[PDB]
Amino acid sequence: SMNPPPPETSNPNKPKRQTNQLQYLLRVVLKTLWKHQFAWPFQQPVDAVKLNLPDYYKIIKTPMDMGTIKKRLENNYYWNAQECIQDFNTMFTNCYIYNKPGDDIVLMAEALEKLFLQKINELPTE
């Protein structure tokens, strides 16, 4: 079994910007979610090999995780905050698509998403 390459976190051709919203997303939002008791399964790409999930990447074709988001924020990959917010949303949605309602991982994702949405209500004006 093999995992796919992770999502891109570096691309010298992609224009980059360091907006106050992106700074908030790193310094406040990501940092707070990262320490949550349920964050650990989301801190790196799903390792379908290690977890014996051979169908994971047959079903999930747009993978995303908080480790990738952290690298994108820390390595100035984004142009705007919406790109980052979309990455979080992709992470959560993938979990809800792949797993059954009521699976522990889904409950963990839902708790993180509730927190994420509350925090982004305080995103500063651009």
Ligand SMILES: CCS(=O)(=O)Nc1cccc(-c2cn(C)c(=O)c3ccccc23)c1
């Ligand atoms: C740090 C990423 S890991 O892959 O190295 N470890 C890890 C450990 C426990 C749980 C999962 C996990 C994560 N997600 C997002 C899932 O959807 C999922 C679905 C079924 C079974 C396990 C998981 C991954």
